[PDB]
Ligand binder design. Sequence first.
Ligand SMILES: CC(C)C[C@H](NC(=O)[C@@H](O)[C@H](N)Cc1ccccc1)C(=O)O
Ligand SMILES: Fc1ccc2[nH]ccc2c1
Ligand SMILES: [Yb+3]
Ligand SMILES: [Yb+3]
Ligand SMILES: [Yb+3]
Ligand SMILES: [Zn+2]
Length: 607
Amino acid sequence: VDTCSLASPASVCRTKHLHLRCSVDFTRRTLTGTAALTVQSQEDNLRSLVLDTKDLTIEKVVINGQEVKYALGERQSYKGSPMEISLPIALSKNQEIVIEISFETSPKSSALQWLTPEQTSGKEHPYLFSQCQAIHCRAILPCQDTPSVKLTYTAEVSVPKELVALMSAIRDGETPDPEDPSRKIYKFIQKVPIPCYLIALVVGALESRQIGPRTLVWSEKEQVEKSAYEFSETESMLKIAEDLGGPYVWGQYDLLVLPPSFPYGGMENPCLTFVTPTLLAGDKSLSNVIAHEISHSWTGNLVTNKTWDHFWLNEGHTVYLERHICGRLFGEKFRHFNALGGWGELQNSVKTFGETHPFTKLVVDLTDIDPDVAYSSVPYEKGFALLFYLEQLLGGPEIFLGFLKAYVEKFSYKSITTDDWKDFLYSYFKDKVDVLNQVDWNAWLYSPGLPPIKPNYDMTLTNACIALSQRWITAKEDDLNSFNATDLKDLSSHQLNEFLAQTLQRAPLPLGHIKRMQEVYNFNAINNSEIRFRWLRLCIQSKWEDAIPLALKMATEQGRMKFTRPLFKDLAAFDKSHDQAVRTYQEHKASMHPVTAMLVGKDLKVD
Ligand SMILES: CC(C)C[C@H](NC(=O)[C@@H](O)[C@H](N)Cc1ccccc1)C(=O)O
Ligand SMILES: Fc1ccc2[nH]ccc2c1
Ligand SMILES: [Yb+3]
Ligand SMILES: [Yb+3]
Ligand SMILES: [Yb+3]
Ligand SMILES: [Zn+2]
């Protein structure tokens, strides 16, 4: 039972297919069109069904070529409004009908961001992109908005002719729009069943460049070159993921680089991963994001969480595979470094929420909770730490990967729960159940706070970071002299980043120390977004006025939530920048991604 959806559940009826015909209108910021749902009943004598919608204008509903009765219930907050459709003929178990719904979206659709030409790189054309995870697909089209249901889809999308549409599907040709030659129709087929949260659309002045046998990179013209370089390891990453998870079943693996307001680092949309332009460090150092989204092609897009309570199944297994790809690519010691980093993110989230907070549970009860509000690292890193702890318990990586590969074959095309997962883990390791019964399942799966056990981590690459961070924290004024640019001589970008994360955990440091840090390390010059983000944070919590404009600038010139939210929060907690933070939010709010807008608003205690 999915408590984030208002639709009839999978035990009642199941959508098999969506055919979407729609037109994008930049002048009105609406999508207008029809969604044809092929719906299979799961019960005897079914006479009505319920769909999720949110800020949708329904014009009519047609079955067998006749307008039919339907109604929108009362809005229930972030869930939207349930649509009740009256079937003209009762259906028997397993019967299929096609239900064609005529709809239009609101400009305020929580799924969409409409960009003005000034908000893009080229400056001549507007741009639109979607983000359906978790429950925003209902703000684009009426659907059973729950991952407990999987459907194939095809779409035809009319856009101004000088623009391009792409979707989470195989692109299947373009032509002039016969209803209006100022426009093109682009067509798309997704032949592999998916949860609706993987539906995705972009429309904009895009070009593509080929970067491997089954990958094109797409973005505005002025990002293409740098993007092809930055993501050049992509094919080699697919080769390792195939080896780990089994065949890649989706045809194409493309990348779309979005404008800087894209709320996430990456979003694993089938055939077309979306990434933030803040990944473009110049040196491929941030590619673990591509490896993570690649991994979802098995864990997440094949095997899917039945409800969002079980999100950890999605993210935990994926981070587990991301870290393996990275370990194959760069060595096992690098996997251990990144894993220990992750536990560090875990300590931070739990500290922030508080150790008894319900959102620190691996499995969460989402009734009444907006998933955008509950989102944190907890399901990623607590989930990852569970799998890493099981790996050490059951005899190392190669053994645990045999389970991962078998778990994917097993649940491919399905949606599963935490108990579905646990059960198969007991079945697969039947010769080791005695070891499995020493795991504190109730603590790991259902208790708040840090996990009860911390796995074993190689420290090789981590030591230099902890050591340099300890020198700075224990330094007094008379020790500042002895820091030099040569302290950084042997640290990769990743270790510089880990150095700052260590140091930020003990923030604030004295203002003197920070000034000296900039003097000898020149962190202000570093354009790597992870590093600059933590270095700006450390600056603002240590109350260094000069960092105020640098922080405001980063928080607004890009909008990846990971960076934008804690930058605004920090700035607001600093008395000197409090007013400017609140003012800047209010000045930028209207042209922000609507989900980012809402969360930053909450965080700042505004409106
Ligand atoms: C390496 C990963 C941790 C990168 C991470 N991206 C992800 O986790 C994606 O796979 C997630 N699917 C992003 C997401 C989750 C929930 C709701 C909306 C969007 C991100 O930072 O965006
Ligand atoms: F959107 C989501 C989904 C699953 C989750 N599990 C813990 C937080 C959380 C947020
Ligand atoms: Yb075709
Ligand atoms: Yb069992
Ligand atoms: Yb001293
Ligand atoms: Zn993910």
